[PDB]
Structure 1
Amino acid sequence: PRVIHINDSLANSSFGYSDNHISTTKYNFATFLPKFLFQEFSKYANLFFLCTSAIQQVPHVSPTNRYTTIGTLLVVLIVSAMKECIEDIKRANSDKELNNSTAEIFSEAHDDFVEKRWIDIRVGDIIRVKSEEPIPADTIILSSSEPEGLCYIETANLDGETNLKIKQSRVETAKFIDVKTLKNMNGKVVSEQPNSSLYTYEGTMTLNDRQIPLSPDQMILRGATLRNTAWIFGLVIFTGHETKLLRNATATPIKRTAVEKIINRQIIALFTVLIVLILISSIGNVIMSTADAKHLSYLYLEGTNKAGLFFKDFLTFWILFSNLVPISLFVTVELIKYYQAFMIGSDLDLYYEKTDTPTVVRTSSLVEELGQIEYIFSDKTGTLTRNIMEFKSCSIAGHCYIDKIPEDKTATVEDGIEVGYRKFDDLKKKLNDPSDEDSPIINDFLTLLATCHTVIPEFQSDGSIKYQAASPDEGALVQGGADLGYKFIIRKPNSVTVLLEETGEEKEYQLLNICEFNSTRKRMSAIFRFPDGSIKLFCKGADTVILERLDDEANQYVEATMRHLEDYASEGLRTLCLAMRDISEGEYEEWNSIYNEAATTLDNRAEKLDEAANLIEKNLILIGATAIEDKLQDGVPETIHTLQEAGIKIWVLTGDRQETAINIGMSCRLLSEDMNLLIINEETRDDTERNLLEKINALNEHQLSTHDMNTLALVIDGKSLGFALEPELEDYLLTVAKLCKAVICCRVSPLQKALVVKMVKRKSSSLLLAIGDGANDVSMIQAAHVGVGISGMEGMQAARSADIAVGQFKFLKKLLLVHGSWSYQRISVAILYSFYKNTALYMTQFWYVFANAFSGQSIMESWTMSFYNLFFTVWPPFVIGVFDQFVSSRLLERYPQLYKLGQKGQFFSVYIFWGWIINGFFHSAIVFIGTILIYRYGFALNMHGELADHWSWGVTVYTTSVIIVLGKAALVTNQWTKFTLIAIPGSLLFWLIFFPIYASIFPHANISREYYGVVKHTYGSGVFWLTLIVLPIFALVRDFLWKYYKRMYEPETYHVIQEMQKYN
């Protein structure tokens, strides 16, 4: 029982409430390390090198320095730590603004509102909120500028709605309007404990000395925003994180990609070859120290202690060959994807001009999947159409009426059901005539278009009136029903008034109760009380959900309206149905109590009131139907034609009728005039089995030619799809949908949009993409792989829960063809090069165990090897993985066939992984056997008979290695930009200068005493400059001659396009 006192800060302070501070920062200066280390050491590479460093701390085992691995581990750890800290700076910067805005609090000591900050707001302080500024906390409305005390708030942020709401104030508290009289308000405010129900509240406010009941209509959430009212006086109840905006926290799922799984297999491949190289050397060591025990007497070996010799020698080659698993790879590939998302969400061709909404990639872990998408689960309304509705036609009592009959079907033959069109003037003449029988039907129809809805009107200075409707077809019904007779004027709580432009009278309909339109319910109802004393109910929705509630005792307009829905949908018009039912007071006395219990239930409300709503919609008298126009977006016919030309199959999951999607599908160039449609419209589960069997056998009885398989399309409604998703029939449905180039599902439930996406991905291997708008296809986006959200008129519910938010549908032709093919080809080669550059060097450590009696002696310096994966070979991967374009963007869209390269996986696989690995072994052996023939006995210098040694030769190996590694990237790159000349030739000049400086200064500080005299014997020797010229050319003559052959006498698809790009 939360007890709140009006004013009196000393009274409510003893309870110990929270403070209005908001912080979404995960890392703080108090427990940063206890959670960052547990998160960083959870991966494979980090935990592997943690045990390697702990093993390296035993005596007489480490072949290099004691800190050559933990030093490199901390470098890649702080690079990951600074990025984890930068994101927390942006989160802390965003939370600072929410604690910096102004909030004037009524101070009883000053008798006026004193401006303070949000963090200074305390429970029980009366605040004054102005217009167009958000609410700081959960505050009840005491009074406002309106005569009754109501306000119009926009409860976005917490939800996806954009329309306005209405919160009314109690008659006892609406009296205190003046600022000076606020000091007289006093009493207790008993409220509930902080909960998460956004639509429930059961507080109790005791104004003065008498208590009054509360309701959820007198509670504004923190995420809301005042829209039209000038000022509001609010009493804070919940503050800080106790508010229903942050107390109801959410969770985000983690999605893995295809390349991430191939990487996991490539790591196991290197881990197996690691144990092989360790066991080969460890066995050869234990047999040579036993066979040649006399020729190795100058080493003073242990002798009888050979049980632990294998273990000590196992740890030695573990530390030696541990560099074959690059730790710089995971950090590089993470920054490459993070940087590619930046270059994608900053393009002009992906920026919408009409609305400043650029493309944003909320999850940068799914960027490479754009170059390998095969299925697209789309949507009709909003995604394929502009979602701007326009009332065009209507049908009342079996008669159709439009404006300006087109041409031929002017006269009506009256062959039973009326077919044709009339004029709107004939509708008015049929209306005002009291002698007609269908005149009350037309009156009840027109009142349905401007009463049953839930639209808030807005008045302007120009005398006109504007309707702000949440659903775009709602505004079409209000404006369509207004510009011919019954106009909707002003809306207020518990009342709806209309004005008849024919006679000038004004009617007041007492809005007694309403029922919200749910995407699963597919039907809206609203029960009013007419001024005559009757209580008449109105209902509207889809035909697949209203006709089940009709009757047959007194309903003769069914066969007439059903035929009119067919000719409307055959043109592409979005149609609805209208119904009504007169109820009594004997049944409403009990049904009202049922609705009240369903509204104030703490258990569940999203489904409880839906059941109580269908309890009253028993009978329905169909009055007529409507028809609304909706056009396609711009450039959509061109993108779908190009996406299908690239080999992508598009599935449409629409919740509307069937013939509408087929007509807009032919105009959208999705279907065709010669395409064979395969309809499946069944009524029972057994009927769907025979239909699916008749489909599959008729397909396999004959071969499918190229022209035959291309001209197949499956059309299955919602009821038929509900049966074909059972475990017995899901296999029959999936085997017939893979043969048709297009699939059009109709009348699909919101939750059925997820079952279709999950069924295809759990019984196949292709990657799925789901694009849509609104709260009906939010589960479709969360269930697929790459989820795309469209920001349209339905709100911002789907654009926030998606991975990529796009302005419209046109931008998929470039997000997938250009930015997808690049992202896949870039990250693929960048990882293959990272495995090659690391193997081409540390493999010489293996060819050397055959020359040091399998001891495990390092060929190169301990710290010079650690700088390999940190300084000199960390930029060619970034250039080829971010700024590389294997084909021009102008030709990537002209020839959409190139998308099939990445769609099949022709750039990244385990078979190609071994190709780069054994290429490293080949280059490793060339530099090894090449130098040992030149530095034979060390007698390779010409400086007064002096000789080289161990360290003067390891430098030549290290230097020749990086010239071939960087020389390999030169053949890999396709585009030579300014960033390329800095990473490939620039990294070479970096080493040619860093070594004479490092080897002449650091040996004096006891860091690398092995380089005391190696600069003179290398840079001063004429043989060192000749081995660097012939060995790199000798090892890269294979790649140069093979690249010329495959490009010339065995080209691929892009090998010919790159030639046309060059010569044109």
Structure 2
Amino acid sequence: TRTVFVGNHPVQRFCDNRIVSSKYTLWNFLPKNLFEQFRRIANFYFLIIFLVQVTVDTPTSPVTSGLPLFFVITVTAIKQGYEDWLRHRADNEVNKSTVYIIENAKRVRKESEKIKVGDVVEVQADETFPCDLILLSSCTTDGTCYVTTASLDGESNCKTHYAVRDTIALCTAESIDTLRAAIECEQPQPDLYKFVGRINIYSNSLEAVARSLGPENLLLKGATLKNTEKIYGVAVYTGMETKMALNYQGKSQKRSAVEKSINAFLIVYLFILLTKAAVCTTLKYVWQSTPYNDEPWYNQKTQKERETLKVLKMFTDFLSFMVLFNFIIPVSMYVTVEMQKFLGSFFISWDKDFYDEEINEGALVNTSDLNEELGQVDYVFTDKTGTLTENKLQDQAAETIEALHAAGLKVWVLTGDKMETAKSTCYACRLFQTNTELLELTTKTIEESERKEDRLHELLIEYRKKLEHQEYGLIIDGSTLSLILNSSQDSSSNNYKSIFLQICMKCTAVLCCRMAPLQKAQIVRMVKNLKGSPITLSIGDGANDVSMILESHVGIGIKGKEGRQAARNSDYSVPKFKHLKKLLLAHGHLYYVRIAHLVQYFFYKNLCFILPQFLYQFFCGFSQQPLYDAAYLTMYNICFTSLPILAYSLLEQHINIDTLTSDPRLYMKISGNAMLQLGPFLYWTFLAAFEGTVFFFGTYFLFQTASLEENGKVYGNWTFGTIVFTVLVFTVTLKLALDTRFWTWINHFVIWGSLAFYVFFSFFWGGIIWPFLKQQRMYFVFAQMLSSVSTWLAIILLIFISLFPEILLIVLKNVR
């Protein structure tokens, strides 16, 4: 629809030559990051607390919730900042590289951004094309340059590119002398091959031959020229409109099942917080009813507080209980879950088993948010030509489908090919075993619509349920399947569809032949909806497999021979199909277990933290008095118990990674989001409720002694909360040291180093930390708590009483 004028000799609408791949700009980084972080639940909930603390008068200082929050928002920025300062530096080199330009018979070298639409560009040997050019002429005879598309479509052949036949005569000679050319080009389309050109270069009299220039003359952006002294083009697309910049297509598939359970636990742990605060308020005013239970003459209210409206105190007392118990929601979870995904998705691209000596390329991570979705896959949607058969099967495209059937998945082969060329080769693909009864709904047997409604019925109501992995494999086509989804809204008594969803759930092998690219996204969408959420994967290599690669729960694009269209819209990309084994079975199983045990432990180690502070309210006058110091309510989540679970989630193989690919037999089947169901959830909740009652009521019975030392000196409430904190830090740390079945030299450094820091800190925070404080409330509280033989014995015991129900499982899990 547009028209280009090269020589400025006539007979806006289009943009400039600048590509942006970043998300933030230095002007608007802070307002655009801080908004998208404080839009999450546990980030907004901790800001509502921090505001409530600075206005209302609350038990705890605002530092206890503004230092861990500012430290967690800052680290989650520095990450997303540098992770985006790349896109600058990644494209800064691409649109700041020098290119020569002939403005008007003047050959100047500008920068790649200063390039405007419709001007002469000269590219000598071995320089990427600054913009989507149209090769008006080349300098050598016959005007042919050899440019390989090493980056655009992954091919590595020296594709030929001819100059405009009519104007190969133009050889570098003063291109302003009445070089009027009317290039009526069409608007951009990302086809990367289809392009209709139209040259109307006016001669002295007339010349308008419609040379439909295309893939032979369109020199694409970012493709390096090879073995040509220099070329002469003109830009008809200048970035964000060129074919190279029309294939980004970034969108939000990233929503794992372990990231929508984190939200189900926050919704639970927030009702535990509204109950701990509503119980302790109802009890605060039942207790306060006795006139000597408020202002009992030793602590007497002040005139201001003794005259506040009772209806308002009942509200401020409620906020002071939400603020006191506000730690029951983990602050440092969001930064740890996403610092683990970033640093963790490197093992999927560093892996030497995802390396092809032919392509000479590895794996690829386009999104680091579905890592745990590789170990939850329930269905697999493949593509016959290209993934299972190269351009006969591929290297190991038959033994992988065994490993995908042993692991309990269901492989569906959505091919855009015929049936006999697909099925009769699927007899070799080895998804269809020899003694597999095949139930075929192909057109060559269903040449009648209503028979199919009987076919659906007779092979189901009298066949499929009146008599199965190695047993049945369904075979469909593109046509008979269309009627089952397109027009299935006529009879609601027994639909075509609701009956088709009964065999698609139990049939482990399915082969849909002659499927248009728009049905591959239907079948994934139909399967994604039935009976909960079968987590579907889709792996393909062509450009017709971009609908289902964008549709499914995770999309694995194969770096094939057709192009990088499926490999760049996908989430992870592997240069083979046989790499599906090591990806799901060894990497997906390890990625899920590492984060499903970091999620459970993050909610556990916080309920053990607050339950001894909720119980203390019964032995305080329900007066919201923090059991622990201030320097312990902040540091606990960010300092004392932060690294041991992070190092765990990065280096921890609860089944040796070599016995995981060797054995799929059950290993993948063990976790269908098992580690986060209701079963294991209220094993960690009722283990943290047991360990919280033990920490308090072992220090409660210990303090009936009148002295715990040999010189007969008594302890306070800071040597009471320190004994509960010492037992609490050592339990939740030695609870992880009981769960690691893979002790690296780092799991020794962060676990035994987090226990020795809490001991070094507590002996240091009890020295010269005076001048800037108004408390000195924990001066020698640690160093005296340890000078008593009876307190070492309690701590050693209460740690073991608390870790007993966990040792009791280990034994009952070894045995039988």
TM over 0.5: yes
Indicate yes or no: 2:666 matched with 1:666: no
The one of 659, 664, 674 aligned to 1:891: 659
| 8 Å Cα contact 1:102-1:116 kept in structure 2 | yes
- The superposition leaves residues 974-1032 of structure 1 with CA deviations (integer Å, 9 ceiling, x where unpaired) of 12221111122221111111111122122233275212342442233333333322221
Contact 2:585 2:668 in 1 (8 A): no
Deviation of residue 782 (structure 1)? 1.3
Deviation at 1:384, TM superposition (A): 1.0
Does the CA contact (< 8 Å) of 2:375 and 2:588 recur in 1? Answer: yes
Q: Secondary structure at the match of 1:934?
A: coil
> Partners in 1 of 2:55 and 2:98 — Cα distance?
62
| Aligned partners of 2:152 and 2:564 also within 8 Å | no
The alignment status of 1:350 with 2:354, answered yes or no, reads yes
Q: How many equivalent residue pairs?
A: 790
In 2, the alpha carbon distance for the partners of 1:108 and 1:668 equals 62
Residue identity in the other structure for 1:103 = V
User: Which position in structure 2 is the counterpart of 1:430?
Assistant: none
For 1:711, the aligned partner's letter is E
Q: What does 1:284-683 align with in structure 2 at a 5 Å threshold?
A: 284-293=283-292, 296-298=295-297, 299-301=299-301, 302=305, 305-387=309-391, 631-681=392-442, 682-683=446-447
* Alignment partner, residue 26 of structure 1: 23
After superposition, the CA RMSD in angstroms is: 3.0
Matched, 1:960 2:727: yes
Say which is worse superposed, 350-359 or 82-91, in terms of deviation: 350-359
2:188 to 196, 204, 212: 196
1:80 pairs with 76, 79, 83, which one? 76
Name the residue aligned to 1:169: 164
2:127 maps to 1:129: no
Structure 1 Cα separation of the partners of residues 496 and 160 of structure 2:
45
Q: Match of 2:474?
A: 714
Among 609, 613, 624, which residue is 1:845 paired with? 613
Q: CA deviation at 1:800?
A: 0.9
* 1:731 CA displacement: 2.2
> Distance in 1 between the 2:352 and 2:142 partners?
50
- Residues 151, 166 of structure 1: 8 Å contact kept: yes
Q: Which of 731, 734, 740 is equivalent to 2:507?
A: 740
> Following superposition of structure 1 onto structure 2, how do residues 108-257 of structure 1 map, counting pairs within 5 Å?
113-122=107-116, 125-131=119-125, 133-145=127-139, 147=141, 149=143, 164=159, 166=161, 168-169=163-164, 171=166, 173-177=167-171, 179=172, 181-182=173-174, 185-186=177-178, 195-197=187-189, 199=195, 205-206=201-202, 212=208, 217=213, 220-223=219-222, 226=225, 231-236=230-235, 239=238, 245-246=244-245, 250-257=249-256
Q: What TM-score do you get using the length of structure 2 for normalisation?
A: 0.90
Amino acid across the alignment from 1:850: F
Shift of 1:125: 4.4
The Cα offsets for residues 540-581 of structure 1, whole Å up to 9 and x where unpaired, read as xxxxxxxxxxxxxxxxxxxxxxxxxxxxxxxxxxxxxxxxxx
Residue identity matched to 2:699: T
1:760 CA displacement = 1.2
The offset of 1:74, in angstroms, is 0.5
Question: Using the alignment, how far apart are the partners of 2:802 and 2:88 within structure 1?
Answer: 53
Change (3 A) 1:209 1:996: farther
Aligned 8 A contact 1:138 1:221 in 2: yes
Deviation of the 1:219 alpha carbon: 5.3
2:492 equivalent in structure 1: none
Q: 1:818 aligns with which of 583, 586, 607?
A: 586
CA deviations 1:900-948 (Å, max 9, x no partner) are 54443332213311211121121111121111222237633344x5432
* Structure possessing the higher relative contact order (Cα contacts under 8 Å, 6 or more residues apart): 2
Residue 685 of structure 1 aligns with which residue? 449
- After superposition, give the CA deviation of every residue in 1:110-166 in whole Å (9 maximum; x if it has no partner): x6x454532454556422223554321244333214645466666786678878475
CA distance in 1, matches of 2:782, 2:502: 70
Q: Cα distance 1:6–1:294, how it changes in 2: closer, same or farther (>3 A)?
A: closer
How far off is 1:1044 after superposition? 1.1
Do the aligned residues in 1 keep the contact of 2:4 with 2:182 (CA within 8 Å)? yes
Find the residue that maps to 1:352 and give its secondary structure: coil
Query: Cα–Cα, structure 1 residues 34 and 738, in superposed 2: closer, same or farther, change >3 Å?
Result: closer
Partners of 2:393 and 2:809 in 1: how far apart? 51
Letter in 1 for 2:279: I
In the aligned structure 1, how far is the partner of 2:247 from the partner of 2:186?
10
Q: Residues 245, 371 of structure 1: CA spacing in aligned structure 2 closer, same or farther, 3 A cutoff? A: closer
| 1:317 shift after superposition | 0.3
Which residue identity does 2:589 align to in structure 1?
Answer: S
Structure 1 pair 286/794, CA: closer, same or farther in 2 (3 Å)? same
* Equivalent pair of 1:162/1:795 in contact (CA under 8 Å): no
CA deviation profile, 1:259-303 (whole Å, cap 9, x unmatched): 222222111111111111100111111222222446733233455
Query: Could you say if the C-alpha distance between residues 1007 and 16 of structure 1 is closer, same or farther in structure 2, counting changes exceeding 3 Å?
Result: farther
Aligned pair 1:1024/2:791, yes or no?
yes
Contact 2:112 2:130 in 1 (8 A): yes
The CA distance in 2 between the partners of 1:219 and 1:294, in whole Å, is: 87
Matching residue within 1030, 1042, 1046 for 2:809: 1042
Q: Any gaps of 5 or more consecutive residues in structure 1?
A: 388-630, 1050-1064
Give the match for residue 272 of structure 2. 273
Superposed CA deviations along residues 230-267 of structure 1, whole A, max 9, x for unmatched, are 53212346546565654887442333222222222111
CA contact (8 A) 2:617 2:625 kept: yes
AA at the equivalent of 2:88: A
Name the CA shift for 1:43/1:202 in 2 (closer, same or farther; >3 Å): farther
Q: How far apart are residue 665 of structure 1 and its match?
A: 1.9
Q: Tell me the alpha carbon deviations over residues 308-352 of structure 1, each in whole angstroms, 9 at most, x when there is no partner.
A: 120110110010011000021122112222233211221122222
CA distance in 1 between counterparts of 2:782 and 2:17 reads 66
Residue 718 (structure 1) shift: 2.3
| Correspondence list, 1:965-984, <5 A | 965-984=732-751
Q: Contact (CA 8 Å) 2:453, 2:496: kept in 1 or not?
A: yes
Report the Cα distance in structure 2 between the residues aligned to 1:800 and 1:78, rounded to whole angstroms: 31
Alignment pair present for 1:46 and 2:43: yes
Determine if contact 2:6/2:119 at 8 Å carries over to the other structure.
Answer: no
Change in CA separation of 1:648 and 1:245 when aligned onto 2, cut-off 3 Å:
closer
Cα distance in 2, alignment partners of residues 16 and 664 from structure 1: 52
How far did residue 80 of structure 1 move? 0.3
Contact 2:185 2:197 in 1 (8 A): no
Q: Compared with structure 1, are the counterparts of its residues 23 and 375 closer, same or farther at alpha carbon in structure 2 (3 Å cutoff)? A: closer
Q: Give me the whole-angstrom Cα distance separating, in 2, the residues matched to 1:325 and 1:715.
A: 50
Amino acid at match of 2:602: S
Shift of 1:875: 1.7
1:22–1:241 Cα contact (<8 Å) kept: yes
The question of whether the paired residues in 1 share the 8 Å contact of 2:185 and 2:198 is answered with no
CA pair 3-51 structure 1, distance change in 2 beyond 3 A: same
Correspondence list, 1:870-1019, <5 A: 870-936=638-704, 939-943=707-711, 945-1006=712-773, 1009-1019=776-786
Structure 1's 24 and 701: CA in aligned 2 closer, same or farther, altered over 3 A?
closer
- Secondary structure in structure 2 of the residue aligned to 1:1010: coil
Asked if the contact 2:411/2:508 (under 8 Å) is kept, the reply is yes
Structure holding more strand per residue: 1
Structure 1 CA distance, aligned partners of 2:806 and 2:103? 81
Q: For 1:650 and 1:237, locate their aligned partners in 2 and report how far apart those are by CA, in whole Å.
A: 45
Contact preservation (8 Å) 2:152, 2:223: yes
The answer on whether the counterparts of 2:118 and 2:234 sit within 8 Å (CA) in structure 1 is yes
Higher Rg: 1
Letter of the structure 2 residue corresponding to residue 713 of structure 1 = G
Q: Which amino acid aligns with 1:69?
A: S
Deviation at 1:670, TM superposition (A): 2.0
* 1:6 and 2:7 correspond: yes
Q: Does the 8 Å CA contact 1:683/1:719 hold for their aligned counterparts? A: no
**Gap change, CA 1:104 and 1:908, over 3 Å in 2:** same
Q: Distance in 2 between matches of 1:757 and 1:240?
A: 34
- Tell me which residue corresponds to 1:863: 631
Deviation digits for residues 497-523 of structure 1 (CA, Å, limit 9, x no counterpart): xxxxxxxxxxxxxxxxxxxxxxxxxxx
